[PDB]
């Protein structure tokens, strides 16, 4: 293989999903949190269990 | 002299030497096309198809196979963070009517 023709194994890599970057992504605005309540807050959500 | 021809799910009133634009035909530029559905012939002698005038034909020369001017299809629903933008260029065939019948 050549350094200008590198290729990762098929299916080994996937681009990370980025929230809060516009409505078309489907994760803009509320960024997948829905609306309000404890779980919509930075650091929100109850203890596991 | 004019004829009513059916093509591309539409109808066109044509005279000889007239340029027409129709839905894409399966032909090449410079070919000769024959329209075989003539509903009506007007002018000196009138012929009324029921629905088509039997044996009547309109010949034409294929000038161009093009794509219509770009349409930007855009819609949205206010307050819903919901919209869609798409482009469209409708294919067309341009021909010149050579002979009626």
């Amino acid at each position: 293989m050549k350094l200008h023709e590198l290729k990762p194994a098929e299916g080994s890599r996937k681009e990370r999903n980025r929230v809060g970057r516009g409505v078309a992504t489907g994760n803009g605005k509320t960024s997948g949190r829905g609306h309000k309540g404890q779980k919509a807050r930075s650091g929100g959500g109850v203890r596991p269990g | 002299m004019f004829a009513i021809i059916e093509t591309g799910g539409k109808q066109i009133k044509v005279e000889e030497g007239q340029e027409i634009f129709v839905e894409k035909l399966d032909v090449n530029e410079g070919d000769t096309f024959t329209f075989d559905k003539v509903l009506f012939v007007g002018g000196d002698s009138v012929k009324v198809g029921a629905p088509t005038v039997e044996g009547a034909t309109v010949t034409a020369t294929v000038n161009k196979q093009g794509r219509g001017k770009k349409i930007t299809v855009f819609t949205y629903k206010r307050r819903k963070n919901s919209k869609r933008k798409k482009g469209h260029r409708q294919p067309y065939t341009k021909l010149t009517i050579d002979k009626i019948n």
Partner: protein
């Protein structure tokens, strides 16, 4: 590494503003209100492509009605007679014929009346 805001913002907004050419005052000048107007323009154009087909059929029907009445026949009965005669000329073509050569339209009218 840091990615500064750069040029993309201006390029994108300028495109919307150019699409707003000819609008009134601030609507051809300010990105926010131009964007809004261009959104409205797209929605209106989508709607009106469909409304245009309705409007032109309406125009053809009106003109055919006038021609039929000149031959002592209503639009409705003329279309019914043409149907029973088996004539498939559509309203656009009927209107253009009635406008462009009246003798041909009179022959169509007689065919309709005979069928009725």
């Amino acid at each position: 590494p840091r990615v500064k805001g750069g040029t993309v913002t201006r390029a994108r907004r300028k495109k919307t503003i150019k699409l707003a050419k000819g609008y009134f005052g601030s609507k051809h000048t300010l990105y926010k209100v131009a964007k809004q107007q261009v959104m409205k323009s797209g929605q209106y154009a989508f709607r009106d492509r469909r409304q245009r087909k309705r409007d032109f059929r309406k125009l053809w029907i009106t003109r055919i009605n006038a021609a039929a009445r000149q031959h002592e026949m209503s639009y409705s009965r003329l279309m019914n007679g043409l149907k029973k005669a088996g004539i498939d000329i559509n309203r656009k073509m009927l209107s253009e014929i009635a406008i462009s050569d009246e003798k041909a339209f009179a022959q169509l009218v007689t065919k309709a009346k005979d069928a009725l």
